[PDB]
Design goal:
This is part of a larger assembly, with one copy of chain A (about 170 residues), one copy of chain B (about 575 residues) and three copies of chain C. Chain A is an all-alpha fold and about 170 residues long. Chain A has one domain (about 1-170): Transmembrane di-heme cytochromes, Chain C (Fumarate Reductase Cytochrome B subunit, Up-down Bundle). Chain A has helices at about 5-25, 40-70, 80-90, 95-115, 130-135, 140-170. Chain A starts with 6 loop residues before the first helix and ends with a helix. Chain B has one domain (about 1-580): Cytochrome-c3 Hydrogenase, chain B (Orthogonal Bundle), CATH 1.10.645. In chain B, a hairpin with a 2-residue loop joins strand 13 (about 510-520) and strand 14 (about 520-530). Chain C has two domains: about 1-180, Rossmann fold, CATH 3.40.50.700; about 180-295, Cytochrome-c3 hydrogenase, C-terminal domain (Cytochrome-c3 Hydrogenase, Chain A, domain 2, Irregular), CATH 4.10.480.10. Helix content of chain C is about 30%, strand content about 10%. Chain C contains nine helices and seven strands, in the order βααβαβββαβαβαααα. Chain C has helices spanning about 15-20, 30-35, 50-65, 90-100, 110-115, 150-165, 175-180, 190-195, 275-295; strands at about 5-10, 35-40, 70-75, 85, 90, 105-110, 140-145. Chain C has a five-stranded parallel β-sheet. A two-stranded antiparallel sheet of chain C has the order 4-5. Classes of the chains: A mainly alpha (about 170), B alpha+beta (about 575), C alpha/beta (about 300). The complex binds protoporphyrin IX containing FE, iron/sulfur cluster (SF4) (3 copies), carbonmonoxide-(dicyano) iron, FE3-S4 cluster (3 copies), chloride ion, magnesium ion and 1 more. One FE3-S4 cluster (F3S) binds next to loops of chain D. Chain B: Pfam families: NiFeSe_Hases. Chain B: InterPro entries: Ni-dep_hyd_lsu, Ni-dep_hyd_lsu_Ni_BS, NiFe-Hase_large, NiFe/NiFeSe_hydrgnase_LSU. Chain B: It is an enzyme of class 1 (oxidoreductase).
Chain lengths: ~170, ~575, ~300, ~300, ~300
């Protein structure tokens, strides 16, 4: 068994809200506590909720993308790119927004997993270890992965401020 | 050829030219050129820094709190001293006062570096100029033992021990793989130690090579690692916990016990191995108490160091005295001010840099580091220097002057300053040393004197270590544990614009960092480093620096083998990455 | 028996890597030099200078051509035709290339030779370049760190001598044995990290109990090295243990990765001091502007 | 000169491991402790006098320096067989202990033996071995547990008491806060693996060869207070976990009877980040794979 | 057993600190003097005067050299060669240095000895200088306040006698026990501060209900001392409790920190009820005015 099609959107939103709130505090952690670190795991739980929200998010996102593809794009190699451009200068800047949004999510996954699979996951995560070499090729290290990952989160939050105001503008 | 008069010297570049490139058994990259007359005497000397990195440029725009970490990498040999200067400077600019323990620990870090740096230089750098390593193969172990035991209390002196050392060396060479000893100057007539003294020396070289690693454990406790320990603006990051839960995660009694154990061992090695060896080289190389005087009987400089009163850099606080002497007038030790635009200035008219007017010197607050490699005609091409044109630009080192005077800095300089300021401990110490050598006080102002003063400094520093440690422990007994001031850590608390100076005495002499902060970022960062002073090129007056002065009038027994040049230069303990940064 | 010939050259450097090498506790640097290898050229330690030093260099690389190990400390500058670093009146890069040509393998000591280190930081006045950007036809073992751990340096040396082979390396050319894991993967303060127990300002109660230094900017989480296990100077300590966060000194371009004291750091390809919060919050406030202007 | 503080070191039922540990001290060396910090006036293991000469020393010290000496106690008294399970000078050891404690200013209880009872007190405690604090009730007793305690911890506690002229601050159990304030598990360099859910499952597996956590091999780190993970053993060379064996819990009361050493600790929170998130991912990947029809 | 010798000297001061000391409720100053220490020199209380007093001074610092505690009230003036404060025809600073030289530790009583206090305020006519600027080679325990709390003074004394050690101190040399926290962090009026409930003028309704004195210039938020917990004169009161804001009298250079009746700066302040009352009326007025009932 499964459910209605809007479940697989409210999920992503739930995942998104969690990956943001948690990922935020992985980089700018909450105030410090004090006790006996045997019985305390606050930061560890934030990271855990993050990685596994990122698991769910990743699965849902990829199935949700697989269908839009199979179904022609949306509506029920740079040619199409250069042509998207001519008709693009005349709602055409709103599609490129929803597209950029799904492009970010995938970037947040490629980068997010490069970090997660690092300490020798040694299985199906083998490709993500090109992302690392790439950032090294850039003349950087895995710290840059963290930085670009944190940036992606802010960029997503930008669309969300737009996409939310744009939706609430459908309070006709 | 050109001919001219400066500071009592005749600078004459006629005659034969000699090139020593690379200068080895120094830090970094140096090129030296000389001219000798028909008698084989040096009539012209050229000091050339053959490297540049540009830290002053790299520090532009960065966070003042990060500065120490960048500048520390100016030099891995005098590791830590630039970081000390940097935190001094930034704390001067912002107006930060560090806790007592933080100051004591910083003094310990400096003292530790003095002990380590002096020791390694004596044996691993300068040592083979005086010790004929291959001649040690001809020594009698039993006699070597008797010599060693006549000079020191040190336990490691058995005939069997020297025999073992001699055998290890003999085996080592019998393979033709002489390594670091290959193509040396062994058998040079200036090698004056008897075979037994060479064996003793070489054994101690090995002992020093081993033991130097232990000294820096003090840096590892308080600064995490060596080379390049860690520091913070506002004090030190090594929080102290003696008597409370979690002391395992801080500097505790056990950590302090380790520090105490290193201090004892360090003073013991310096006093009974290095000191007697320095004294021994003195006994066998007395003519060198009259060679390589240079500027040391004319102009010497010290900023002073080791503030014993926290945040007080005045005369009542610095345990190592500061001051300047010019024109050989050692009877008036002049006060030094690093803010005064009239005192410290740098000239680039003979260096590979650009000024709006290269005929004037710039105080570091007005400093400019604009590098341009422009050698002029160098009897070669631009990538094939056969001879530096010492008339024009010939070095990556700036030319520092104090009130227009060329100065010598370092252990000898400091000793003279302290001596003539009437520091009782210093006076007594120096007179004893010279009395033992049956030399006048003047004998210190020489190539030999530099080496002697360095050794004496190591002994001074080792003594100081224990002093500082005791000060720390007294604070701890009194419940004074604070190691940092956090109050003005946040850039929001800083003045919008401010500037400061950080100074201390590095192993090689007077060090200064000049820093200007604007809007929480570094607007200016200029460094004048001890070897910058000593290895300085000429100025618009044609005045020569410490190295060039010291090499003047020097007799060479064989010019195809620059042993006398090496002896004098090495006596300064050149650090070229420091000089150029 | 004969020992393997080693040529140790120096480019732009602070000589910290050489200094580290002689700190080795086991084996002692003394025993390495005397018994394990033949240190045939090394400016810092050799007796010969000038033309005598040059003769040694040419003689070693010629007589032991294709058989010696080249150890490289520092890096070559490309600026001013290479004359930012001059050796025997010529650009250091020529020496490097000449030495590399006859080497059977090359050791890149420290962050300098591996990556570029401090002189290569913005704006790299001299165009300091890591060795592997210049020498592309030789096996290069990167042993990064500023400097690397003394006993790591010697362990790598003893490995190559004893096992007569190069150590296995990661995709970056670093030996897996000491650089296969991150500091954060073996840091004794991890218990505090995961508990959310952090030092917030220097010398607070948290610092006095040895709490995690993540909020003080520790770059342990992204830095591969052995410091948290092997430790420094005969296992006495390492940066974090003495209360300062890891700077990331073993990592490529760590100098230009923002403040050492901040979690969110400079993105070089995007301005002078623009970080992910800078660029990110600017974009968030710019949409809020559009979203509130249009809504009136 | 200066007199040193008189120290009387007595031995009950023990293995003499604590005395051995004491002389392992790296800083200060045991030699210097004996020479300069204290006056070790009685100690069966080291003293020249035996028999009636030893008895005379004992009597003379505790009488002359009555109320002014420190009593160090290694081992513990047996209550069984009227105390004749441990006989000193033809009398029950407990009589010696009581006589020594009556004149002491303060008592140091070396090791788990004196602190708790250790191995001889394990089920069924044939001799009724009893910790010192159960016998002596009117004197300050500083418990320095461990089997044995860390050498440098022992000397540090001694140097503390000499230098600062006072007893170290203690928990409710009498252990010095300085070294027993935290758990092994809270300063263990393998926490990263614990926290990730990366465990050794059997000896010398790939996990063990990478130095993964030993929680599932029975490590009692999570319930053991000691300094082994920070201070470390034998001049900071190693500690049990670092050399691949889990903590036995040897600093803790009755640790011998807390089940097998290879049995997992209980009531310790443990939820791995990567272990949980790997499960969450496959659970979701497998739910989808089932619905699509590419199950297995 | 003999009692620890204490030498109590006086520089430029008001004798407020000596007065405070004798206010001690527990232990009584009487019992401190008879049973806990040996107050061997103290100009205010000793019988001997002139040459007799000088003889006592010399005898104590000689006989008990290296073993006595030096208690310092007031401070030395550097102006006029030190002759702004004259003791036995000579500058007080000479007696200070002499007494310091033989002391094992120095207690700097009050703001005067610790910092400078009122005489060091602008323009410091006599160049009054705190003890730690003059004596640099001795442990100095600063016990600031004008004067310090009587029972804090005696508690510090009893600590050093009973525990035979100096109290742990901050980086400023203040005993952590009584100076580790700010007045504002233990003030019984913090509820009002946090609510935004302030006295605005003297004897208003807010003052008669014991509201916060932040707006009346209370320097509590920047002052380290124990007045809000230990309180004054056997726990009877402290400045804020009797309706006056903290002057900051335990802090360095507090006399020159602007008027006492001027608000303190860079202290975060955001009321709970003062903010929520504002958000409410902003919303209610936007609403009531739209409906039409602005009246
Ligand atoms: C909308 C998608 C996501 C958002 C908004 C998000 C947000 C964040 C943020 C802000 C950080 C902190 C970066 C820093 O300051 O260092 C972070 C860390 C991280 N994220 Fe994500 N993330 C997302 C997706 C993912 C995914 C799919 C994964 C894959 C498992 C992932 C794995 C990680 C990891 C491994 C870290 C750092 C863990 C650590 O070392 O503590 N993220 N995330
Ligand atoms: S101090 Fe650094 S390496 Fe250690 S646990 Fe914290 S972040 Fe990780
Ligand atoms: S269970 Fe043991 S091995 Fe694992 S982190 Fe805890 S103390 Fe270390
Ligand atoms: S400002 Fe003054 S009256 Fe108000 S809470 Fe703070 S200390 Fe008390
Ligand atoms: N000593 C030293 Fe290095 C130089 N010159 C510095 O500073
Ligand atoms: S700063 Fe470098 S020394 Fe190790 S702890 Fe970090 S890699
Ligand atoms: S067994 Fe004992 S030795 Fe330490 S590691 Fe556990 S407390
Ligand atoms: S005025 Fe002084 S008395 Fe206390 S309340 Fe303020 S510190
Ligand atoms: Cl030794
Ligand atoms: Mg400079
Ligand atoms: Ni240097």
């Amino acid at each position: 068994f499964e459910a209605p099609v809007r479940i697989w959107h409210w999920l992503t939103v739930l995942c998104m809200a969690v990956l943001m709130v948690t990922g935020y505090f992985i980089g700018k952690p909450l105030p410090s506590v004090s006790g006996e670190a045997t019985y305390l795991f606050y930061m560890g739980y934030i990271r855990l909720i993050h990685f596994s929200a990122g698991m769910v998010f990743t699965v849902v996102l990829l199935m949700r993308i697989y269908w839009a593809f199979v179904g022609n794009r949306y509506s029920r190699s740079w040619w199409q790119g250069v042509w998207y451009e001519i008709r693009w200068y005349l709602n055409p800047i709103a599609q490129a927004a929803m597209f950029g949004y799904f492009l970010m999510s995938v970037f947040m996954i490629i980068t997010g997993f490069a970090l997660y699979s690092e300490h020798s996951q040694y299985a199906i995560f083998a490709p993500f270890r090109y992302v690392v070499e790439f950032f090294y090729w850039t003349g950087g290290n895995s710290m840059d992965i963290h930085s670009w990952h944190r940036l992606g989160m802010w960029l997503i939050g930008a669309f969300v401020i737009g996409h939310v105001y744009m939706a609430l503008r459908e309070d006709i | 050829s050109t001919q001219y008069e400066t500071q009592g010297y005749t600078i004459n570049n006629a005659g034969r030219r000699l090139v020593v490139d690379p200068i080895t058994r120094i830090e970094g990259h140096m090129r030296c050129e000389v001219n000798i007359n028909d008698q084989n005497v040096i009539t012209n000397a050229v000091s050339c820094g053959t490297m540049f990195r540009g830290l002053e440029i790299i520090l532009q725009g960065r966070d003042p709190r990060d500065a120490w970490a960048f500048v520390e990498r100016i030099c891995g040999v005098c590791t830590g001293v630039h970081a000390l200067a940097s935190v001094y400077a930034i704390e001067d600019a912002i107006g930060i006062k560090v806790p007592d323990n933080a100051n004591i620990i910083r003094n310990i870090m400096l003292a530790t570096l003095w002990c380590h740096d002096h020791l390694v230089h004596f044996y691993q750098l300068a040592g083979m100029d005086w010790i004929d390593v291959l001649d040690a193969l001809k020594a009698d172990p039993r006699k070597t033992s008797e010599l060693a035991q006549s000079l020191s209390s040190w336990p490691k002196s058995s005939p069997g021990y020297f025999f073992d050392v001699q055998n290890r060396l003999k085996k080592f060479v019998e393979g033709g793989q002489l390594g670091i000893f290959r193509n040396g100057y062994w058998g040079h007539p200036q090698y004056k130690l008897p075979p037994e003294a060479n064996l003793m020396g070489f054994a101690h070289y090995l002992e020093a090579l081993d033991f130097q690693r232990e000294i820096v454990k003090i840096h590892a406790v308080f600064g995490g690692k060596n080379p390049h320990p860690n520091w913070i603006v506002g004090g030190m990051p090594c929080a102290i916990n003696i008597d409370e839960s979690g002391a395992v995660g801080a500097v505790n009694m056990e950590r302090l016990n380790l520090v105490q154990s290193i201090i004892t061992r360090t003073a013991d090695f310096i006093n009974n191995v290095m000191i007697p060896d320095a004294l021994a080289i003195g006994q066998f190389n007395k003519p060198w108490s009259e060679i390589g005087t240079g500027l040391s009987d004319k102009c010497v400089l010290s900023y002073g160091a080791f503030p014993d009163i926290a945040n007080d850099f005045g005369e009542k606080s610095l345990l190592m005295p500061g001051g300047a002497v010019i024109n050989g007038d050692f009877n008036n030790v002049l006060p030094v001010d690093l803010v005064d635009p009239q005192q410290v200035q740098e000239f680039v008219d003979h260096a590979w840099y650009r000024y709006p007017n290269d005929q004037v010197g710039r105080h570091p607050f007005d400093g400019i580091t604009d590098p341009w490699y422009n050698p002029g005609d160098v009897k070669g091409s631009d990538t094939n220097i056969q001879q530096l044109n010492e008339q024009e630009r010939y070095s990556w080192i700036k030319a520092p002057r104090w009130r227009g005077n060329a100065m010598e800095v370092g252990p000898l300089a400091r000793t003279l300053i302290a001596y003539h300021k009437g520091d009782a401990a210093t006076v007594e110490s120096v007179d004893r040393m010279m009395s033992a050598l049956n030399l006048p006080l003047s004998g210190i102002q020489s190539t030999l004197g530099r080496i002697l003063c360095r050794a004496h400094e190591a002994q001074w520093a080792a003594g100081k270590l224990q002093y500082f440690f005791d000060k720390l422990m007294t604070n701890l007994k009194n419940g004074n544990l604070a190691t940092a001031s956090t109050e003005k850590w946040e850039p929001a608390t800083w003045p919008t614009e401010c500037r400061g100076v950080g100074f201390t005495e590095a192993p090689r002499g007077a060090l200064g960092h000049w820093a200007a902060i604007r809007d929480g970022k570094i607007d200016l960062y200029q460094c004048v480093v001890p070897t910058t002073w000593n290895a300085s090129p000429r100025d618009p007056k044609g005045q020569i620096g410490a190295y060039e002065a010291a090499l003047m009038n020097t007799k060479m027994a064989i010019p195809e083998q620059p042993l006398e040049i090496l002896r004098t230069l090495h006596s300064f303990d050149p650090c070229l990455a420091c000089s150029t940064h | 028996k004969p020992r393997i010939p080693v040529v140790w050259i120096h480019g732009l450097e602070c000589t910290g890597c050489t200094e580290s090498f002689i700190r080795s506790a086991h084996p002692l640097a003394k025993d390495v030099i005397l018994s394990l290898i033949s240190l045939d050229y090394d400016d810092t330690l050799m007796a010969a200078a000038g033309t005598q030093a040059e003769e040694v260099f040419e003689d070693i690389i010629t007589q032991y051509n294709g058989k010696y190990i080249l150890a490289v400390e520092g890096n070559p500058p490309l600026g001013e035709q290479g004359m930012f670093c001059i050796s025997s009146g010529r650009p250091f890069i020529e020496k490097l290339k000449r030495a590399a040509a006859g080497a059977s393998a090359i050791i890149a000591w420290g962050t300098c030779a591996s990556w570029g280190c401090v002189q290569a930081a913005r704006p790299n006045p001299t165009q300091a370049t890591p060795i592997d950007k210049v020498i592309t036809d030789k096996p290069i073992i990167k042993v990064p760190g500023c400097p690397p751990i003394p006993d790591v340096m010697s362990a790598i040396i003893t490995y190559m001598v004893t096992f007569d082979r190069l150590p296995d390396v990661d995709r970056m050319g670093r030996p897996l044995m000491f650089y296969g894991q991150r500091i954060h993967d073996k840091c004794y303060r991890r218990a505090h990290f995961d508990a959310g127990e952090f030092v917030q300002s220097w010398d607070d109660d948290a610092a006095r109990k040895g709490y995690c230094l993540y909020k003080m900017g520790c770059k342990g989480p992204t830095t591969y090295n052995a410091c948290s296990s092997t430790r420094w100077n005969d296992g006495v300590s390492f940066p974090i243990q003495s209360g300062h966060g890891c700077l990331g000194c073993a990592e490529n371009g760590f100098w230009d990765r923002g403040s050492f004291y901040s979690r969110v750091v400079d993105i070089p390809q995007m301005g002078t001091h623009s970080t992910a919060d800078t660029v990110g919050l600017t974009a968030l406030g710019v949409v809020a502007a559009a979203v509130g202007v249009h809504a009136v």
